[PDB]
Amino acid sequence: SPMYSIITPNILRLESEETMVLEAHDVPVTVTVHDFGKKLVLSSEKTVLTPATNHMGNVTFTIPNREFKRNKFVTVQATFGTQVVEKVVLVSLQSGYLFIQTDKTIYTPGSTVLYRIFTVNHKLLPVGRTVMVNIENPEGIPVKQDSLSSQNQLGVLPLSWDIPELVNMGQWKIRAYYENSPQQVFSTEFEVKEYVLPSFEVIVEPTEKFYYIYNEKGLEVTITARFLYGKKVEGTAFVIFGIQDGEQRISLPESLKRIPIEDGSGEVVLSRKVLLDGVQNPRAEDLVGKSLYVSATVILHSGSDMVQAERSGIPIVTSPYQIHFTKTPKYFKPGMPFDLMVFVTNPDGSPAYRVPVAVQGEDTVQSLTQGDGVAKLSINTHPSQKPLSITVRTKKQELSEAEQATRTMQALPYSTVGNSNNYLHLSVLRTELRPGETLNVNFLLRMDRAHEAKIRYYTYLIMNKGRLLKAGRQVREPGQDLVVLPLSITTDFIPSFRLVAYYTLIGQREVVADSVWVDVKDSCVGSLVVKSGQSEDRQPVPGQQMTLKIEGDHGARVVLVAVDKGVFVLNKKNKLTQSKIWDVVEKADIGCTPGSGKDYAGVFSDAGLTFTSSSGQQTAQRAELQCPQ
Amino acid sequence: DGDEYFIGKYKEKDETLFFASYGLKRDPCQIVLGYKCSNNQTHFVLNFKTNKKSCISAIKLTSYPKINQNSDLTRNLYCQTGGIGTDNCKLVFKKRKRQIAANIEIYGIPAKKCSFKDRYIGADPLHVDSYGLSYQFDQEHGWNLERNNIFKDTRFSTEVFYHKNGLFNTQITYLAEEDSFSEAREITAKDIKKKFSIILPNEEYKRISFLDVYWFQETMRKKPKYPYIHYNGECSNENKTCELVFDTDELMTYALVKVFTNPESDGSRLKEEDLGR
Amino acid sequence: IVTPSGCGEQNMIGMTPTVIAVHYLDETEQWEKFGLEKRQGALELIKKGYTQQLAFRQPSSAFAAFVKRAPSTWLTAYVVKVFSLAVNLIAIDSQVLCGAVKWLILEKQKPDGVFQEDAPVIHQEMIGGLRNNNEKDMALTAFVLISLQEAKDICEEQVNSLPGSITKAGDFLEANYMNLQRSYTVAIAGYALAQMGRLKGPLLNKFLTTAKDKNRWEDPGKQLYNVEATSYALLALLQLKDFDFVPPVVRWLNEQRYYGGGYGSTQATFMVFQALAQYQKDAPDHQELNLDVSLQLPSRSSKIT
Numbered sequence A: 001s002p003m004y005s006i007i008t009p010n011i012l013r014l015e016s017e018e019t020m021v022l023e024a025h026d027v028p029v030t031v032t033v034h035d036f037g038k039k040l041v042l043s044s045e046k047t048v049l050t051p052a053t054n055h056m057g058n059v060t061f062t063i064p065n066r067e068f069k070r071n072k073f074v075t076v077q078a079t080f081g082t083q084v085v086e087k088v089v090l091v092s093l094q095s096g097y098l099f100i101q102t103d104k105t106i107y108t109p110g111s112t113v114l115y116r117i118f119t120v121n122h123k124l125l126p127v128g129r130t131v132m133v134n135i136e137n138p139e140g141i142p143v144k145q146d147s148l149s150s151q152n153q154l155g156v157l158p159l160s161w162d163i164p165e166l167v168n169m170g171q172w173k174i175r176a177y178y179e180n181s182p183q184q185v186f187s188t189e190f191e192v193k194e195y196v197l198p199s200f201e202v203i204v205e206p207t208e209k210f211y212y213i214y215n216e217k218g219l220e221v222t223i224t225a226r227f228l229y230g231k232k233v234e235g236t237a238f239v240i241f242g243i244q245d246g247e248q249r250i251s252l253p254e255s256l257k258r259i260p261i262e263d264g265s266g267e268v269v270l271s272r273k274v275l276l277d278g279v280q281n282p283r284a285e286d287l288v289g290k291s292l293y294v295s296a297t298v299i300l301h302s303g304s305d306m307v308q309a310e311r312s313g314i315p316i317v318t319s320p321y322q323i324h325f326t327k328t329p330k331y332f333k334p335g336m337p338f339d340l341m342v343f344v345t346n347p348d349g350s351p352a353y354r355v356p357v358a359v360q361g362e363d364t365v366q367s368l369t370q371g372d373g374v375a376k377l378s379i380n381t382h383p384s385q386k387p388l389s390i391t392v393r394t395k396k397q398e399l400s401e402a403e404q405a406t407r408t409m410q411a412l413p414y415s416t417v418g419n420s421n422n423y424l425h426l427s428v429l430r431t432e433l434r435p436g437e438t439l440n441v442n443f444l445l446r447m448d449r450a451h452e453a454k455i456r457y458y459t460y461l462i463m464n465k466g467r468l469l470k471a472g473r474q475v476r477e478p479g480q481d482l483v484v485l486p487l488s489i490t491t492d493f494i495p496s497f498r499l500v501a502y503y504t505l506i507g508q509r510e511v512v513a514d515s516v517w518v519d520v521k522d523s524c525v526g527s528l529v530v531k532s533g534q535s536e537d538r539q540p541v542p543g544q545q546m547t548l549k550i551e552g553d554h555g556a557r558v559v560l561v562a563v564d565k566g567v568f569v570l571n572k573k574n575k576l577t578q579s580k581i582w583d584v585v586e587k588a589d590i591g592c593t594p595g596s597g598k599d600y601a602g603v604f605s606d607a608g609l610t611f612t613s614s615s616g617q618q619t620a621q622r623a624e625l626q627c628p629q
Numbered sequence B: 001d002g003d004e005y006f007i008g009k010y011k012e013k014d015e016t017l018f019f020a021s022y023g024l025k026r027d028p029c030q031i032v033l034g035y036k037c038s039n040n041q042t043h044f045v046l047n048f049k050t051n052k053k054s055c056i057s058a059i060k061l062t063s064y065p066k067i068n069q070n071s072d073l074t075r076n077l078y079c080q081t082g083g084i085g086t087d088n089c090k091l092v093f094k095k096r097k098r099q100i101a102a103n104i105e106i107y108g109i110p111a112k113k114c115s116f117k118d119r120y121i122g123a124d125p126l127h128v129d130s131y132g133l134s135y136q137f138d139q140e141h142g143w144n145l146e147r148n149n150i151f152k153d154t155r156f157s158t159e160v161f162y163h164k165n166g167l168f169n170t171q172i173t174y175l176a177e178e179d180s181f182s183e184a185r186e187i188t189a190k191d192i193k194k195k196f197s198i199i200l201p202n203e204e205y206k207r208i209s210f211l212d213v214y215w216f217q218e219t220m221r222k223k224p225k226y227p228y229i230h231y232n233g234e235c236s237n238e239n240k241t242c243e244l245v246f247d248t249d250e251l252m253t254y255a256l257v258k259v260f261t262n263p264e265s266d267g268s269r270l271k272e273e274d275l276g277r
Numbered sequence C: 001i002v003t004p005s006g007c008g009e010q011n012m013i014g015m016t017p018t019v020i021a022v023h024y025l026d027e028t029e030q031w032e033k034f035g036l037e038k039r040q041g042a043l044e045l046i047k048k049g050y051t052q053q054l055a056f057r058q059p060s061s062a063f064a065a066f067v068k069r070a071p072s073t074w075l076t077a078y079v080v081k082v083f084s085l086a087v088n089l090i091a092i093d094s095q096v097l098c099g100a101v102k103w104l105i106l107e108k109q110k111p112d113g114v115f116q117e118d119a120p121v122i123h124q125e126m127i128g129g130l131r132n133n134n135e136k137d138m139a140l141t142a143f144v145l146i147s148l149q150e151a152k153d154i155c156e157e158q159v160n161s162l163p164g165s166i167t168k169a170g171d172f173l174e175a176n177y178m179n180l181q182r183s184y185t186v187a188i189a190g191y192a193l194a195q196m197g198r199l200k201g202p203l204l205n206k207f208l209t210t211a212k213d214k215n216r217w218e219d220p221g222k223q224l225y226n227v228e229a230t231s232y233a234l235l236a237l238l239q240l241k242d243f244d245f246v247p248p249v250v251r252w253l254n255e256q257r258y259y260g261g262g263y264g265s266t267q268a269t270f271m272v273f274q275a276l277a278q279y280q281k282d283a284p285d286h287q288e289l290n291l292d293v294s295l296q297l298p299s300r301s302s303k304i305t
């Protein structure tokens, strides 16, 4: 009777299953969906609330139609026996993904192209719909287009094309998209150029990825060449250097060297003088922000082959580290301690390992970083409402004081009414979480200091892949200030999740909330293993036969392809890997802010969630499709 | 130039279902848009089944090179399961030794509100029929003759069945000079059964004196099986509402009746050699 | 932005912008700028205004400025038309609307064939520049004809005398088409006349030549006629599917760029925005494209099409 509350996803995708969380805070309730003027009725559901079940309604339904051809809305209403609450939400069109695989990377005229298409939905499960595919030449005008359906195939489409004999050269593109929503497309590239297959591979590598401008030894690289079947090589190599600026390349003619390669090992060294004389910049500090690259060519002693290998993008820097603030909440916590999570990386982007950080203002407040290069820190508040500025600086040992990276960040306060000011944050070591492990969500809490013996429970929700995975309810008895949730991490939580919790207090009306972002280890939920079932006696011989052993989950389909390893030497771009799949699925989430907005409406609307109340204590709306910037 | 074969009538406000070109010596076909065919020494068949909500209107086929044979005395195109109005039918074409190409097009119209009465009724129903050939009578008895330059067939004596462009015909009785046109009635595909009937009025000056039926259908083989269209009971002056009953051996897909009215008709009119068993 | 509030006429002038916004944002969906985070509040205001309009009904099964005001033809028929546009959009009692239409048929049908509405208009803020009662009779006859046409698809079976009345009105006004001076009323009457297809030949010639300079359908005073006047012809040409004078209509529409709303914005604004709606639905940014190419070579027995 006092209140009735509805929790809904921010954006609902057509042709799927969605949920609402109903909280009456012995009543039949019904929910209904209407269009926006009034297109008859879409769907409706009926449920009852039971006092023994804490009055929680986990109402699920499937959203349908063909009339849905700018952006459009839909109204959802619910009557809880006597009173009605309604809200208008947006409808989108993106309803799946598309992955394209090709057997090879570089072709010749007269050959054939063979490719496959995989179709999956939001949950990454097979589906069947209609798709269309176009092939585009280098200029851009389509050459061949086609339409297909993938019904009763479990979601694999093989195709084929045949390059003519008298054709252009360069880069060709394949573009595929669903028939329903032509706004979103997926693309793949390949090359067309005559060639002849090589016979051995060449690798160029430096000793340090960066290049400190104050070294007297210059830059040193090493050359390693090897045959395809495993034996070593001999020959002679020519090496040259260059300088790369933003869309610009400068060649230094004075730096060209000839070296004999014996047993596949060569050494090249570049000094300061040549680099300084090549450019017109006596001041060394002006060189920061420009990159280097090296090119090498290897010839045999029989005058039979010619291979070229290039490494590009050696940065020029003075600090061998870097600091970041990509995943730190921006709104601080008045009174209660504020927790920061720093991010340290190598200059090439690879995460660092075992490097200590600290704060210049305080002392001994330091920690290390695990394999992900993330360190956890805490800081106390004034707690005056004046915004505070914090600074971070690396405190690694055995290094000079003048080569330490540092930076600064700013925070903003939280606008509560009546000074309730209640938050949430987990006091556990942020380590490599793994599926099958356990987590201990520790409610670090600070109610009002006067009459904190009135609150009975809290409400919490888990968000993953833009859907409500689970909704819980944890209680407590008066006089406590710390409770724990022993969560059991399952395989469905991959790759990350967001926890949001709140509670309601009797004033006027009080609602307080917070949110937290957590990440787990990334790997496919299934398991596929390929190995050699043979006795593994010795190396095979051409024309022989062998046995191949596969292991995977029951009732699946396995597709195979074998490609020579000489093709990858010519062009080794645009391949398929699980990391690509996780990147694609992660890049298209809803809530992009880490969390902990300015107020309850901010925290609820910054995680792709909508809260409506019978007393009019609702949240603002959004009608765009992506968060700013 | 090339020869042409038609099914149905074309209108200037129809969109194409599909449009393709086929060779007539390859084995097998080239699968175009995921359809099915079959090709032999003396047959070429195609399977069609659309997905959008539409009703088919006309079909046209063009063949090269020109051959010395007229294209109206026999049947060369016919589809076996469906027809005009139903969203699918299986086309069959009979070749010769000298035909090596074909071009095929199909037109249709939106499914819900599609009717064909506006075309086959013509602009002058009193002088020209649906075929295009005008009526011509006998001056001494005032009874229409039998058009002779079209494919006509008989089952037994004293029966006629014409055919042209996939459209059949059957004239119930003989026609007089002073007849008038009253109206027309059409029957769509959702009211077609193995046996059905239709009610017409015969109130005072709406006396029925002539009925001619036009209908499409299917044929299992080149020899068709014409349905029985008899005249239930007797439609004399007394019984005001008169029924027409069909009795089909194969399923039709469309029908059209052109009622004619004449107040002077006594109900009986027959030739002097048609009358005795 | 005009908030729908007040009596029946004020509610009407506040709710026809609602309908034009509904269509224009069905084509665009820019409800964000309809009150700066007030779209739900605006819709609630619209609904309460509609409820107030319903509460102002009369025992005569008609809606007027007040429950006590004598019902008129023009206001009740306009409300019927808008509700007919919104039968499937909002809670509209179809039986009530059809009963009102049938009472309109059975009560206000003068034997002279010219329809007149009871309550005279006092303020010019909604009618426009036609306060002078000189040729209002033909305009109101055309308005009643339009009411009959819109009721033809809603109350087709209850009254079967509609074709006879329409034929009588068309026969009476067939020779009266050559006795009008003001251009915009000629344009709207011709749009109604061609809505069932009765405007061709020399009638169309006199229709087009009525406008000044063959393009501008302006009358002395009431500059808001501009973005209004040619608008009528567009819908008229929408009935004829003629897009030769519609482009000049568009050019003359863009020559004023007047904000509008309030004074005289009761029929012109709705007409111009509905005309834009069908213009964009039937004529997108692209034009018709359909080609057939056939090439023949001297070494093949077929032709490539």
Ligand SMILES: *[C@@H]1O[C@H](CO)[C@@H](O[C@@H]2O[C@H](CO)[C@@H](O[C@@H]3O[C@H](CO)[C@@H](O)[C@H](O)[C@@H]3O)[C@H](O)[C@H]2NC(C)=O)[C@H](O)[C@H]1NC(C)=O
Pocket (backbone or CB within 6 Å): B038, B039, B040, B041, B042, B043, B044, B045, B092, B220
């Ligand atoms: C070349 O192919 C055509 C069809 O593409 C063949 O014509 C069809 O042949 C089939 C098989 O004999 C006929 O079906 C048969 O019909 C009887 C009638 O009672 C029925 O019992 C069975 O369904 C049986 O299969 C079919 O009628 C015939 N005509 C069509 C489909 O129009 C043709 O025979 C083939 N050429 C040669 C030399 O076989």
Ligand SMILES: *[C@@H]1O[C@H](CO)[C@@H](O)[C@H](O)[C@H]1NC(C)=O
Pocket (backbone or CB within 6 Å): B231, B232, B233, B234, B235, B236, B238, B239, B240, B241, B242, B243
């Ligand atoms: C003729 O009248 C009889 C009277 O019983 C009736 O049964 C029969 O159906 C009528 N025939 C027609 C064609 O109306």
